[PDB]
Write an enzyme that holds these catalytic residues in place. Sequence first.
Site, PDB file in Angstrom:
ATOM      1  N   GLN A 275       0.781  -1.230   0.000  1.00  0.00           N
ATOM      2  CA  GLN A 275       0.000   0.000   0.000  1.00  0.00           C
ATOM      3  C   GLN A 275       0.814   1.281   0.000  1.00  0.00           C
ATOM      4  O   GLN A 275       1.965   1.307   0.444  1.00  0.00           O
ATOM      5  CB  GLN A 275      -0.915   0.013   1.217  1.00  0.00           C
ATOM      6  CG  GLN A 275      -0.142  -0.186   2.517  1.00  0.00           C
ATOM      7  CD  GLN A 275      -0.959   0.181   3.722  1.00  0.00           C
ATOM      8  OE1 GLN A 275      -0.898   1.315   4.193  1.00  0.00           O
ATOM      9  NE2 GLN A 275      -1.757  -0.764   4.218  1.00  0.00           N
TER      10      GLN A 275
ATOM     11  N   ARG B 240      -3.415  10.968   2.741  1.00  0.00           N
ATOM     12  CA  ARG B 240      -4.515  11.533   3.498  1.00  0.00           C
ATOM     13  C   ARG B 240      -5.424  12.302   2.545  1.00  0.00           C
ATOM     14  O   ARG B 240      -4.924  13.056   1.700  1.00  0.00           O
ATOM     15  CB  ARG B 240      -3.969  12.474   4.567  1.00  0.00           C
ATOM     16  CG  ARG B 240      -3.094  11.796   5.594  1.00  0.00           C
ATOM     17  CD  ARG B 240      -2.780  12.769   6.701  1.00  0.00           C
ATOM     18  NE  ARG B 240      -1.999  12.220   7.809  1.00  0.00           N
ATOM     19  CZ  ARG B 240      -0.711  11.907   7.742  1.00  0.00           C
ATOM     20  NH1 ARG B 240      -0.050  11.991   6.592  1.00  0.00           N
ATOM     21  NH2 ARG B 240      -0.100  11.473   8.821  1.00  0.00           N
TER      22      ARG B 240
ATOM     23  N   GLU C 167      -4.225   3.377   0.027  1.00  0.00           N
ATOM     24  CA  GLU C 167      -4.954   3.547   1.260  1.00  0.00           C
ATOM     25  C   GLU C 167      -5.230   5.029   1.451  1.00  0.00           C
ATOM     26  O   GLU C 167      -4.327   5.828   1.681  1.00  0.00           O
ATOM     27  CB  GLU C 167      -4.159   2.995   2.439  1.00  0.00           C
ATOM     28  CG  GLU C 167      -4.886   3.170   3.761  1.00  0.00           C
ATOM     29  CD  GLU C 167      -4.013   2.809   4.945  1.00  0.00           C
ATOM     30  OE1 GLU C 167      -4.040   1.657   5.405  1.00  0.00           O
ATOM     31  OE2 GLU C 167      -3.286   3.685   5.419  1.00  0.00           O
TER      32      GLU C 167
ATOM     33  N   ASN D 253      -9.626  11.604   7.919  1.00  0.00           N
ATOM     34  CA  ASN D 253      -9.899  12.057   9.277  1.00  0.00           C
ATOM     35  C   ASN D 253     -11.215  12.804   9.255  1.00  0.00           C
ATOM     36  O   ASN D 253     -11.357  13.798   8.538  1.00  0.00           O
ATOM     37  CB  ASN D 253      -8.798  12.981   9.779  1.00  0.00           C
ATOM     38  CG  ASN D 253      -7.473  12.278   9.931  1.00  0.00           C
ATOM     39  OD1 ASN D 253      -7.401  11.157  10.430  1.00  0.00           O
ATOM     40  ND2 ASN D 253      -6.410  12.931   9.490  1.00  0.00           N
TER      41      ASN D 253
ATOM     42  N   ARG E  37       9.362  19.749   0.514  1.00  0.00           N
ATOM     43  CA  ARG E  37       9.212  18.632  -0.414  1.00  0.00           C
ATOM     44  C   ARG E  37       9.529  17.274   0.194  1.00  0.00           C
ATOM     45  O   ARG E  37      10.257  17.177   1.176  1.00  0.00           O
ATOM     46  CB  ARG E  37      10.097  18.851  -1.644  1.00  0.00           C
ATOM     47  CG  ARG E  37       9.552  19.887  -2.576  1.00  0.00           C
ATOM     48  CD  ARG E  37      10.393  19.925  -3.808  1.00  0.00           C
ATOM     49  NE  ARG E  37      11.762  20.304  -3.499  1.00  0.00           N
ATOM     50  CZ  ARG E  37      12.782  20.136  -4.342  1.00  0.00           C
ATOM     51  NH1 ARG E  37      12.577  19.567  -5.523  1.00  0.00           N
ATOM     52  NH2 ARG E  37      14.007  20.524  -3.999  1.00  0.00           N
TER      53      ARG E  37
ATOM     54  N   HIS F 225       4.751  11.700  -6.049  1.00  0.00           N
ATOM     55  CA  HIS F 225       3.508  11.273  -6.704  1.00  0.00           C
ATOM     56  C   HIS F 225       3.352   9.758  -6.687  1.00  0.00           C
ATOM     57  O   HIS F 225       4.285   9.023  -6.342  1.00  0.00           O
ATOM     58  CB  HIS F 225       3.496  11.718  -8.162  1.00  0.00           C
ATOM     59  CG  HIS F 225       4.675  11.240  -8.943  1.00  0.00           C
ATOM     60  ND1 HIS F 225       5.802  12.009  -9.132  1.00  0.00           N
ATOM     61  CD2 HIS F 225       4.918  10.056  -9.553  1.00  0.00           C
ATOM     62  CE1 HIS F 225       6.678  11.328  -9.848  1.00  0.00           C
ATOM     63  NE2 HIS F 225       6.166  10.139 -10.110  1.00  0.00           N
TER      64      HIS F 225
ATOM     65  N   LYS G 263       9.477  19.063 -22.292  1.00  0.00           N
ATOM     66  CA  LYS G 263      10.341  18.327 -23.223  1.00  0.00           C
ATOM     67  C   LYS G 263      10.203  16.790 -23.138  1.00  0.00           C
ATOM     68  O   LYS G 263      10.651  16.062 -24.037  1.00  0.00           O
ATOM     69  CB  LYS G 263      11.801  18.750 -23.045  1.00  0.00           C
ATOM     70  N   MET G 264       9.609  16.290 -22.053  1.00  0.00           N
ATOM     71  CA  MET G 264       9.223  14.883 -22.006  1.00  0.00           C
ATOM     72  C   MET G 264       7.886  14.737 -22.715  1.00  0.00           C
ATOM     73  O   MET G 264       6.841  14.892 -22.099  1.00  0.00           O
ATOM     74  CB  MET G 264       9.088  14.376 -20.568  1.00  0.00           C
ATOM     75  CG  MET G 264      10.384  14.356 -19.780  1.00  0.00           C
ATOM     76  SD  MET G 264      11.649  13.329 -20.542  1.00  0.00           S
ATOM     77  CE  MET G 264      12.979  14.521 -20.710  1.00  0.00           C
TER      78      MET G 264
ATOM     79  N   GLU H 227       1.403  10.467 -12.096  1.00  0.00           N
ATOM     80  CA  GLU H 227       2.088  10.375 -13.381  1.00  0.00           C
ATOM     81  C   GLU H 227       1.310   9.431 -14.283  1.00  0.00           C
ATOM     82  O   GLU H 227       0.831   8.392 -13.822  1.00  0.00           O
ATOM     83  CB  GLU H 227       3.497   9.845 -13.184  1.00  0.00           C
ATOM     84  CG  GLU H 227       4.436  10.115 -14.355  1.00  0.00           C
ATOM     85  CD  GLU H 227       5.865   9.707 -14.018  1.00  0.00           C
ATOM     86  OE1 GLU H 227       6.692  10.571 -13.674  1.00  0.00           O
ATOM     87  OE2 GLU H 227       6.168   8.509 -14.081  1.00  0.00           O
TER      88      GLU H 227
HETATM   89  C1  LIG Z   1      -8.745   2.801  16.920  1.00  0.00           C
HETATM   90  O1  LIG Z   1      -7.443   2.982  17.464  1.00  0.00           O
HETATM   91  C2  LIG Z   1      -6.384   2.928  16.596  1.00  0.00           C
HETATM   92  C3  LIG Z   1      -6.594   2.706  15.242  1.00  0.00           C
HETATM   93  C4  LIG Z   1      -5.518   2.640  14.377  1.00  0.00           C
HETATM   94  C5  LIG Z   1      -4.233   2.797  14.881  1.00  0.00           C
HETATM   95  C6  LIG Z   1      -4.012   3.032  16.246  1.00  0.00           C
HETATM   96  C7  LIG Z   1      -5.103   3.095  17.107  1.00  0.00           C
HETATM   97  C8  LIG Z   1      -2.591   3.143  16.434  1.00  0.00           C
HETATM   98  C9  LIG Z   1      -1.915   3.452  17.743  1.00  0.00           C
HETATM   99  C10 LIG Z   1      -2.153   2.353  18.744  1.00  0.00           C
HETATM  100  O2  LIG Z   1      -1.971   1.175  18.255  1.00  0.00           O
HETATM  101  O3  LIG Z   1      -2.492   2.544  19.885  1.00  0.00           O
HETATM  102  C11 LIG Z   1      -1.987   2.962  15.238  1.00  0.00           C
HETATM  103  C12 LIG Z   1      -0.527   2.945  14.937  1.00  0.00           C
HETATM  104  N1  LIG Z   1      -2.962   2.757  14.251  1.00  0.00           N
HETATM  105  C13 LIG Z   1      -2.731   2.596  12.846  1.00  0.00           C
HETATM  106  O4  LIG Z   1      -1.935   3.312  12.270  1.00  0.00           O
HETATM  107  C14 LIG Z   1      -3.488   1.550  12.086  1.00  0.00           C
HETATM  108  C15 LIG Z   1      -3.714   1.749  10.730  1.00  0.00           C
HETATM  109  C16 LIG Z   1      -4.413   0.821   9.985  1.00  0.00           C
HETATM  110  C17 LIG Z   1      -4.904  -0.308  10.602  1.00  0.00           C
HETATM  111 CL1  LIG Z   1      -5.884  -1.422   9.689  1.00  0.00          CL
HETATM  112  C18 LIG Z   1      -4.678  -0.541  11.943  1.00  0.00           C
HETATM  113  C19 LIG Z   1      -3.969   0.387  12.681  1.00  0.00           C
HETATM  114 ZN   LIG Z   2       7.369   9.051 -11.570  1.00  0.00          ZN
HETATM  115 ZN   LIG Z   3      -1.518   2.044   6.165  1.00  0.00          ZN
END
Ligand SMILES: COc1ccc2c(c1)c(CC(=O)O)c(C)n2C(=O)c1ccc(Cl)cc1
Ligand SMILES: [Zn+2]
Ligand SMILES: [Zn+2]
Lengths: 179, 177
Positions: free
Chosen positions: A29, A33, A95, A99, A118, A122, A152-153, A168
């Site tokens: 993956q 965000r 993925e 949020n 930076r 991509h 030029k590409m 890309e």
């Molecule tokens: C609901 O509470 C969570 C959910 C996801 C979490 C964490 C806590 C923590 C922190 C912790 O584990 O306490 C981390 C690092 N998480 C991830 O990045 C993560 C990403 C994708 C999946 Cl499928 C599973 C976990």
């Molecule tokens: Zn590239």
């Molecule tokens: Zn992930």
Amino acid sequence: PASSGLTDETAFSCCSDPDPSTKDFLLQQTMLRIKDPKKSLDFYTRVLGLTLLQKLDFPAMKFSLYFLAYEDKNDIPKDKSEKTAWTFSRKATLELTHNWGTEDDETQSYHNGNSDPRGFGHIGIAVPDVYSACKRFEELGVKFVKKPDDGKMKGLAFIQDPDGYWIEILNPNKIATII
Amino acid sequence: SSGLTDETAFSCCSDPDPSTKDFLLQQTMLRIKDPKKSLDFYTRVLGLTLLQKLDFPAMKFSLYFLAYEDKNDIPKDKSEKTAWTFSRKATLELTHNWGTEDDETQSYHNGNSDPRGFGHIGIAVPDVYSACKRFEELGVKFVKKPDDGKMKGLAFIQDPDGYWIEILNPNKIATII
Ligand SMILES: COc1ccc2c(c1)c(CC(=O)O)c(C)n2C(=O)c1ccc(Cl)cc1
Ligand SMILES: [Zn+2]
Ligand SMILES: [Zn+2]
């Protein structure tokens, strides 16, 4: 001595054959965000032709994960537990992390990595024909970073997703011709 | 907030247009400060193979393409090798702008602090604990050890530029949630 990068020699000298412990590892993956899955889901499925493999919600932490990939929807197990093991074992997925709330916050946006500061540049998609893909993208209102014959590409494009991430667009069988 | 219901999310998905037929997700590109460190990391530590290297002296940079591929499957002649590399699924393009490795004041941004965007790449492995035990042994830096926190059995390490790399076991994810 001003850096002229590595020779092919140095580069390959830095490269080790995989240790047997790493023999079943896969590059599963790339996470980005996203501000608004309504837009992102539309773009990635309708414009680029990916399939949404799975939506995972995490109420305790107020985010959702959307996994997209080039897979046949008929191959996705319906069962939640089986869906999960299948999704996380596909190669080359996106993925998209949502949020909760960001879509309604006028002050919020994510950074695409291509201006200060930076880092990430991509993701990239191989297509059988860049010109036709981009003409289609144009008819669909896709924002372009680089049209296929600008710069030029020639025969190589960059488009943007709804968060402004660069993508890309390339024909793997014509890259060598433009170096 | 509350986030999307399944209905809303699903309604925003279209079936693939036939013209996107053999489109494939080919590469994720990251800029890297030092290719000697990066290539050592991705090959020796992670077990990827360097498929091809491209230089563009006009614009002072190299592109390195790595994937989980058998190197005996890599074509010898340049044209054929290029076409194959760029048609492999799930590759990593590491972009080295000549100079940066000698510049003490230079570092790239990993997307995990303000301003946020890109988060990580993720590796599916058979055993997260044996994988991380080896990483530890090898000097790899960690963000989240496999056994820390609520989601045990899942880890995040850093590459030589500080980009996060998730380490997951597909058969233990559903359990972990
Ligand atoms: C609901 O509470 C969570 C959910 C996801 C979490 C964490 C806590 C923590 C922190 C912790 O584990 O306490 C981390 C690092 N998480 C991830 O990045 C993560 C990403 C994708 C999946 Cl499928 C599973 C976990
Ligand atoms: Zn590239
Ligand atoms: Zn992930």
